[PDB]
Amino acid sequence: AKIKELMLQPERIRNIGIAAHIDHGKTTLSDNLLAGAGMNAANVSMVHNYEGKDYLINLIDTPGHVDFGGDVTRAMRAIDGVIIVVDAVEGVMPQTETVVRQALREYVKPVLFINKVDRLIRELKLTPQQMMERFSKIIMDVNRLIQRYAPEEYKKKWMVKVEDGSVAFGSAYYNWALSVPFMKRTGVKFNEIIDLTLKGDNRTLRQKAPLHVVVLDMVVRHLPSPIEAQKYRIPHLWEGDISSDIGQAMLNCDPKGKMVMVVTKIIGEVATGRVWSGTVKSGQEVYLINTKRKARIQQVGIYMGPERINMEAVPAGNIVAVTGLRDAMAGETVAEEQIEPFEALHYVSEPVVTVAIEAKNVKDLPRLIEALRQLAKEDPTLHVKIDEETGQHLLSGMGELHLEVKLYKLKKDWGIDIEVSEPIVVYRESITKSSPMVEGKSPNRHNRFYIVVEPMPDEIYNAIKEGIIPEGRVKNPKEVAKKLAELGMDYEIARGIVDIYNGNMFIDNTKGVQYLNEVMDLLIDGFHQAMDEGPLAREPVMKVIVRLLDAQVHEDNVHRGPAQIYPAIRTAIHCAMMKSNPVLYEPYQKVIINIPYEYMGAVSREITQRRGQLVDMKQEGEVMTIIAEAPVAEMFGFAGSIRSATSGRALWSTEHAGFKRVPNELAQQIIRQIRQRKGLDPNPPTEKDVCPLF
């Protein structure tokens, strides 16, 4: 009822998370763990009395999907200690071995909790010593993982010690546990739990050997304080320099140092994250180290139980909720001395894969569209065709699993078993060489436009998409032109820049064309139209520069509608492109695969079999992280091929890798199939079809 000022003392804070296989009990465990102490969500906090002193324990949301690298790894470096949860019936699984691997990767100290022991007693009918056998082999399994993947400084005192209470046993549904210290201190042994269980005398058991007591005791007695933890954690956590005065702001858990925090997850807008150094209050100033912008906070607050509560000044080593943070990502390093963030600069990316969806039941018609658009703005990478009845809607995102998650929102959560189309790869179109000049006549023959199109230099393209140069109509030509002139472009061309559009640009290099300024917006609409659908397979265009070299505009707007400016410039752009050797581009993925060494060849061979290439390779002892690039079109079904080849011990993710040119040998076939899917004639139009005659 007044516990808000434990946060002063860092060595009573416990930053922890629960690692578990699925159905193994983790949600239940957490619910009755923290209900047991009084009072997905981002973070939920509980205060617990251990040895007369009160501890503030942080239970942070931690996903467990092993086909998700990034989220899982992010949540687990957010925490300092972990409760590994294993079903006693099922045991240590390959997936358990994985989540343990990452847990232990970023120096997270572990404690084991065998759950579902009631199932052993009532349902599975074991002798006490069969239970001893089964407990001890789960323990031994885990301790050969700790043997195998722990840092050399830790692989024998980071083991789990049944005898010192680093291993609890119990039932999360029946709110009971047992460890040897709790026995030491209460005289409760297994015979009574078995007995009471068998009578069905749950309520006695509840309060003869209470879950949250035994478990949280194990937490405090064995999982480390933030200042306990950062002493070895922050160096491994990211490639900075410790000699910074900010280095031992983060090395210990210094509140009076510069503040430094990271966002763990986002939720009206509310960001939950961890404070590494310093102290936030509402309204100071914060530079978001690599999200382009910088900002400040409207409310600051902390967590009491499951409930969002508001306070002001919070020191380091705690978990905070903040609002007002516009474009912060999950994983956002927020601090104000500018340094480099704790994980890599993540490309913001465009959606690259699509599936078509149809409701089974006629009655789910009315506003599926805004459900799916709840998630379309929940996850910024998603786009869909809104409204009317098409068949209905295309869902476009970042990959197969990305989307199929959303499918199992279509019914784990909302009520519809669903039929989904095959997936299609969003391809794009571009050119390889510069064109001769091309003319665009309007139908009334009164307006003419002389253009060339040129392949865009990858430096400038990169510049546009990593944000250095901005999308949209140019709001400051003089400044933009310079930044184009920094990359190998002619300033006296760059100054006529007019528009940036989806990896292309439009430049006015005309001298004294009367009335051009009157059509220029229409010229841009036509430009955009020209880019929206390419001339090869009506796919979006990338890496093209359209330069207007000359023009003849009529003096009366009666001869200058959209009806005349659009087709003229649009087909000029397509004609030019067809003369500039137009090509297909496909999306790639960066694939990050983390495994035990024994499997590498298999992994490697798999990537080779998907037109993929190994890019990089990071090794830490017996754990191996392979980084590759492979085309999206070749990556379907990867979770299966890879689960098979690494026997479910691979932990992996993808990131957008940009787009690359499709080889000519496969290009044609792919173009014909795209056109065919689109209801078009397979054979791509050539320049003679697109350009007008004599």
Partner: peptide, 9 residues
Amino acid sequence: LAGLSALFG
């Protein structure tokens, strides 16, 4: 793992 046996008795 000797502590484990203490829990049974």
